[PDB]
Amino acid sequence: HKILHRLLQE
Amino acid sequence: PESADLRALAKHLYDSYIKSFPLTKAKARAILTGKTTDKSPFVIYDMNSLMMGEDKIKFKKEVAIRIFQGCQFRSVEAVQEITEYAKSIPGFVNLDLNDQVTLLKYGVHEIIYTMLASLMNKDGVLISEGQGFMTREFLKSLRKPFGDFMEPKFEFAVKFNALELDDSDLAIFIAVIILSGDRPGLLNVKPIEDIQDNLLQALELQLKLNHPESSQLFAKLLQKMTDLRQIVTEHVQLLQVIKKTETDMSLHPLLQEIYKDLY
Ligand SMILES: *c1ccc([N+](=O)[O-])cc1C(=O)Nc1ccccc1OCc1ccccc1
């Protein structure tokens, strides 16, 4: 779930 | 009283919704009913129209495949938008990042359906930020499995739009969907439900105030929330089918993240 993780960290 | 705090939460959420989402229900209806000194959108009803109107399509292979790709492009952006909005819901980011992910993973399709309804009427859907209008009859008429992909979303939207909710209602409603404590695989349900309780009260008050005309709009809207789960199950499955059966078609990574271990 990297993209989701990344979208959430931005 | 507490009403003041609830009102303030509603207005925070409305504002965040306005920033997060490019096309409001308000503008979309204005477009859909021609109530705007702005040229109407390019109607796409057949393969010809699509050709003539492919210059107008937002997208950056057969027709059905191409339409679904365009529909897939916009879906990914919707998830980016829903995710940004989620971040703004008070105390969502303070949750465990593994739960943040779980919520969104199950939440987005329910909200995408909600969002689409803002863009739909009985006969078609607004696309490319209201610049195109793709007809229901046309989408329906696509070859299988693609012809029956959008029709369930059309069916929900005629029912859902009967409630005549506006953007201020929708903002809170959306927040309520995201913060569901009953999603498969949540690590820590208690702080989720604590926020949802605030949100539901915020929603009840909003609906009473914004629509004193209509009592049990709150009850009616909560019943839609429960339908939408099982409606989203059908959609999840039909995609997993389309993934396997159509080898030519690449499915977007982010989308795939959300279909993994879903039902
Ligand atoms: C369309 C096709 C596939 C997927 N998907 O793989 O999950 C999603 C969608 C979709 O949900 N589209 C969509 C969602 C929310 C707002 C706007 C959307 O696009 C509508 C549309 C665009 C272009 C052509 C037809 C419909």
Side-chain angles (χ1 to χ4, degrees):
Chain A
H1 290 130
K2 308 199 213 309
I3 302 178
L4 269 174
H5 275 94
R6 196 176 324 114
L7 288 170
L8 285 161
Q9 283 301 85
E10 196 272 328
Chain B
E2 302 187 357
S3 306
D5 298 305
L6 292 180
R7 284 311 315 156
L9 175 59
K11 294 211 184 192
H12 169 83
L13 290 179
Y14 177 76
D15 288 0
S16 170
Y17 168 107
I18 291 295
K19 294 178 186 178
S20 283
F21 298 101
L23 181 60
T24 74
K25 195 191 171 158
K27 195 171 166 73
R29 292 293 107 167
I31 294 166
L32 280 172
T33 51
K35 308 294 179 167
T36 170
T37 313
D38 210 327
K39 68 182 159 161
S40 44
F42 196 93
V43 183
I44 288 176
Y45 64 89
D46 65 4
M47 273 187 58
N48 300 124
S49 310
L50 169 60
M51 252 281 273
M52 298 174 85
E54 261 171 329
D55 281 29
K56 303 296 186 178
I57 214 163
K58 192 158 78 131
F59 169 97
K60 306 315 215 329
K61 307 162 182 177
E62 45 170 321
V63 166
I65 295 285
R66 271 196 324 286
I67 289 173
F68 182 91
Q69 279 293 125
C71 182
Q72 208 192 120
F73 179 88
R74 174 54 208 167
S75 192
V76 170
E77 298 190 324
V79 173
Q80 298 161 358
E81 289 156 2
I82 297 158
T83 295
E84 280 280 285
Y85 183 66
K87 294 197 221 173
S88 70
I89 303 170
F92 171 89
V93 300
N94 296 339
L95 301 181
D96 191 34
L97 196 77
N98 276 251
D99 284 355
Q100 289 186 39
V101 170
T102 310
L103 293 179
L104 284 163
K105 186 170 168 53
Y106 283 94
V108 293
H109 295 125
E110 291 175 11
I111 295 158
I112 276 158
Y113 268 71
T114 297
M115 286 167 69
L116 281 174
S118 296
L119 308 182
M120 287 169 165
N121 71 12
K122 65 181 179 179
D123 303 306
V125 61
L126 286 177
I127 60 157
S128 297
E129 280 159 295
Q131 292 186 351
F133 178 88
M134 191 166 298
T135 76
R136 184 177 187 176
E137 183 178 316
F138 175 51
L139 282 160
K140 210 175 191 167
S141 71
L142 296 177
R143 76 163 179 77
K144 310 221 162 195
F146 296 118
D148 318 293
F149 184 82
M150 291 295 298
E151 195 60 21
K153 299 157 168 221
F154 277 105
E155 267 157 358
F156 173 78
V158 306
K159 298 187 175 216
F160 188 75
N161 290 338
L163 316 190
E164 300 194 50
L165 305 175
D166 80 343
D167 291 300
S168 55
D169 313 316
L170 281 168
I172 304 169
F173 183 55
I174 276 164
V176 169
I177 292 161
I178 291 177
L179 286 159
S180 301
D182 63 275
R183 302 300 191 178
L186 288 165
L187 307 189
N188 189 22
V189 171
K190 290 174 182 183
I192 289 167
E193 293 190 335
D194 294 345
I195 304 160
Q196 200 184 40
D197 184 39
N198 281 351
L199 288 171
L200 282 158
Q201 285 175 36
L203 187 61
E204 183 152 43
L205 176 54
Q206 171 64 21
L207 294 184
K208 272 157 162 174
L209 290 180
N210 200 220
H211 302 64
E213 67 210 15
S214 192
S215 307
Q216 311 313 325
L217 184 42
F218 181 74
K220 197 202 298 184
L221 184 47
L222 287 167
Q223 292 173 40
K224 293 289 169 215
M225 214 168 65
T226 321
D227 296 320
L228 198 44
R229 287 231 173 102
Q230 295 180 62
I231 294 165
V232 161
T233 304
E234 171 185 338
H235 165 258
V236 159
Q237 290 166 7
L238 175 66
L239 280 153
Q240 286 176 233
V241 168
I242 295 158
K243 166 66 179 165
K244 289 176 166 169
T245 53
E246 315 280 332
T247 60
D248 183 272
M249 180 175 277
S250 296
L251 180 65
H252 188 286
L254 179 55
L255 295 200
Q256 294 188 132
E257 283 194 8
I258 305 161
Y259 299 78
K260 301 296 208 224
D261 320 326
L262 255 186
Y263 312 114

